[PDB]
Amino acid sequence: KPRGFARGLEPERIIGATDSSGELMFLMKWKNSDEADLVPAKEANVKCPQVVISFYEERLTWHSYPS
Amino acid sequence: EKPRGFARGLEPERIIGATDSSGELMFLMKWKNSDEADLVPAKEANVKCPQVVISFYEERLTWHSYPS
Amino acid sequence: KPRGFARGLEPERIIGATDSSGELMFLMKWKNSDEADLVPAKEANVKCPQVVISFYEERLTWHSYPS
Amino acid sequence: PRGFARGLEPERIIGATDSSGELMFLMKWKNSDEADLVPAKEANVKCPQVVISFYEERLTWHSYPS
Amino acid sequence: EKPRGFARGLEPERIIGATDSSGELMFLMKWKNSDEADLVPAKEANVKCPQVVISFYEERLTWHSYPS
Amino acid sequence: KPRGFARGLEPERIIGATDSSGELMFLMKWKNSDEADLVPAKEANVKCPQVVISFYEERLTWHSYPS
Amino acid sequence: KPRGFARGLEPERIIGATDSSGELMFLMKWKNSDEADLVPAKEANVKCPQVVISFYEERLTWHSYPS
Amino acid sequence: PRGFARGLEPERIIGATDSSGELMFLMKWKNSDEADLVPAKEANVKCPQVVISFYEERLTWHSYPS
Amino acid sequence: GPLDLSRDECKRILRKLELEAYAGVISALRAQGDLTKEKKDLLGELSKVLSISTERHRAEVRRAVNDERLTTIAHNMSGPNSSSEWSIEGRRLVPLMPRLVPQTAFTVTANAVANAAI
Amino acid sequence: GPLDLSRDECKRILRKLELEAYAGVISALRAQGDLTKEKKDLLGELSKVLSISTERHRAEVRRAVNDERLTTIAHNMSGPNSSSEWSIEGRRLVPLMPRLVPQTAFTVTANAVANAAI
């Protein structure tokens, strides 16, 4: 079964992110499907830039700058 | 022994997570002027910082069938 | 004629929502009235925050996803 | 004039702030030592990859306690 | 029309010269906080800034026959 | 025994000077006394400034020199 | 007649200075002679350094720094 | 330690002041970015040409009016 | 000639001098040790006089905090605890979130409604 | 390695950073125009915090006043009268005297006396 963008669906909203795999991955909810799956940030950055920007923008908080 | 959650006397900045434990909704709260976020009961946050709670939900709203 | 919150009625509960208009709108059921109005979340958020929160708490969704 | 009005190519965002009430980015333009603030709403569409690069580089993790 | 010498209300810093004119000893006075030095009668300087006058003379003292 | 200004006499006039001792000294003639004392210029300058000035004013020297 | 240091006399005190000749010259009073004459600063700087230093030191005044 | 106590060769005097009550020179030493104040009485004998150079370069003329 | 500068060129040079001047003070202060109230007030007056914005200021602080050489000098001059206050002074907006894990993969999902009055 | 600096080397670097920092601010301020009370007070606080002596300060002012490029920038930014106050701030001790001329070739000459009591 195809997964990620291979499902040919439209990005709705990124639900979460993680780099535990060695690269940044986004958990993507696609329009009209409640089955979300992982997509590389490298791919999402290109295919759905505003969806990626929204994910980050709505999670901004002030934080001290580490040493 | 150290204060936790709202007892730290900090102003809420933004909720950055939510989970279930023992059977109660909890929010991982990022407080203003502190890098250390911690858990607070949703029941408490709903009353003390409603707009912060609403913002958390609103910016994550998705649809079963996308509207047109 | 007054519509939505302008009717001066007490909110009972949000029966539904939609953002197809460009902004999030809530279908509000008012106490003592079977005539529901679509009102801006912008307004509902400050007029009846607990009613809004209750709406979101009924739809909490945690995702399970393939590795 | 300032911001995108300068007619310069965005190079990279060096800072962000919501002190004005809206999200603003301190933009560093190509071939220029002078950086100015531009609305995030505007940078988002005019240079989406510059904005994404900015955020991705500063992504900060915070685990749940227990 | 502008004030000259002690009338300028400045404090003496150092006398940098002395000459004869019309038949009266005059001192070229360098004033504190001003680059412009001007003439003042020795008669006046002797009274108003004796140590400044003495310093001018003392540091220029020479001998007809050097003492041993 | 008290010498120089320590005699408490009123200065009459400086009759001469010399700095062979390492510092300028004035040979002071005191009023009502034919016994002159060599006193430090350091002292005479503040004790009797006008007497000192008078000494210098009698010896003003302007130089003429070859080109 | 020899002049300046050529007179074989000892420097006592510099009386004045001028660069009107194109170079800095000092009017030198020699010990035991009331006939002072001009000597190049370049020469005096080497032959009687303390006499030159004294001349300058006793003429120091605060002054603004030109543009 | 400071001044000639540093055991460095004097390079040039950059300033002078009598604020302390005695004439002091701000000395710049060879092979060192740190300058310190030294008594003029001391510099006069230890490096007379450095002192003379300092004064000669700053010699300022003032004519008599009339 | 070198001194034949246009009004615009003069403005550019001045702005560069102002930025370099501010950066230089930030570097020197960071090297001395952690930020203090005295130094914070001084920087406030300096940024005012040199027309340095708040966010340019914070970026310069981060630059200095991130400099290992200045950090090492500070450790030698005033010991550890030489960056806590600087770190707060150089605070920035960042996407802050827990790494994705099923138990935290959260979202609110709703069934969209119609329109107007119903 | 680059970060292996002795305590003494750290002190030398810090002192250099402090001097360059002060010099940089002097240059920037001179380029803006003439010295003002506001700027003088700022420099006083800066020299205190950066341990810059009064005479090192005056020497830096003279350096900036003597810089034709900074002077030219100042003239373009705030017009003439851009150095009167700086010139006073950078005041220095100088041998001040009239050029030698017979009428001014002056000295006090005396006949030396003996010693002790006479």
From Swiss-Prot, chains B, E:
<feature type="domain" description="Chromo 2; shadow subtype">
    <location>
        <begin position="10"/>
        <end position="68"/>
    </location>
</feature>
<feature type="site" description="Interacts with the PxVxL motif of TRIM28/TIF1B">
    <location>
        <position position="63"/>
    </location>
</feature>
<comment type="function">
    <text>Component of heterochromatin. Recognizes and binds histone H3 tails methylated at 'Lys-9', leading to epigenetic repression. Interaction with lamin B receptor (LBR) can contribute to the association of the heterochromatin with the inner nuclear membrane.</text>
</comment>
<comment type="subunit">
    <text>Homodimer. Interacts directly with CHAF1A, EMSY, LBR, TIF1/TIF1A and TRIM28/TIF1B PXVXL motif via the chromoshadow domain. Interacts directly with histone H3 methylated at 'Lys-9' via the chromo domain. Interacts with SUV39H1 and SETDB1, KMT5B and KMT5C. Interacts with PRDM6. Interacts with POGZ. Interacts with CHAMP1. Interacts with INCENP. Interacts with SGO1; the CBX1 homodimer binds to one molecule of SGO1. Interacts with LRIF1 (via PxVxL motif). Interacts with HDGFL2. Interacts with CHD3. Interacts with CHD4.</text>
</comment>
<feature type="site" description="Interacts with the PxVxL motif of TRIM28/TIF1B">
    <location>
        <position position="19"/>
    </location>
</feature>
<feature type="site" description="Interacts with the PxVxL motif of TRIM28/TIF1B">
    <location>
        <position position="18"/>
    </location>
</feature>
<feature type="modified residue" description="Phosphoserine">
    <location>
        <position position="68"/>
    </location>
</feature>
<feature type="cross-link" description="Glycyl lysine isopeptide (Lys-Gly) (interchain with G-Cter in SUMO2)">
    <location>
        <position position="43"/>
    </location>
</feature>
<feature type="site" description="Interacts with the PxVxL motif of TRIM28/TIF1B">
    <location>
        <position position="28"/>
    </location>
</feature>
<feature type="site" description="Interacts with the PxVxL motif of TRIM28/TIF1B">
    <location>
        <position position="60"/>
    </location>
</feature>
<feature type="site" description="Interacts with the PxVxL motif of TRIM28/TIF1B">
    <location>
        <position position="61"/>
    </location>
</feature>
<feature type="site" description="Interacts with the PxVxL motif of TRIM28/TIF1B">
    <location>
        <position position="39"/>
    </location>
</feature>
<protein>
    <recommendedName>
        <fullName>Chromobox protein homolog 1</fullName>
    </recommendedName>
</protein>
Curated annotation (Swiss-Prot), chains I, J:
<feature type="domain" description="ENT">
    <location>
        <begin position="10"/>
        <end position="94"/>
    </location>
</feature>
<comment type="function">
    <text>Regulator which is able to repress transcription, possibly via its interaction with a multiprotein chromatin remodeling complex that modifies the chromatin. Its interaction with BRCA2 suggests that it may play a central role in the DNA repair function of BRCA2. Mediates ligand-dependent transcriptional activation by nuclear hormone receptors.</text>
</comment>
<comment type="subunit">
    <text>Homodimer. Interacts with the transactivation domain of BRCA2. Interacts with CBX1 (via chromoshadow domain). Interacts with ZMYND11. Does not interact with CBX3 or CBX5. Component of a nuclear receptor-mediated transcription complex composed of at least ZNF335, CCAR2 and EMSY; the complex stimulates the transcription of nuclear receptor target genes such as SOX9 and HOXA1. Within the complex interacts with CCAR2 and ZNF335.</text>
</comment>
<feature type="region of interest" description="Interaction with ZMYND11">
    <location>
        <begin position="98"/>
        <end position="102"/>
    </location>
</feature>
<protein>
    <recommendedName>
        <fullName>BRCA2-interacting transcriptional repressor EMSY</fullName>
    </recommendedName>
</protein>
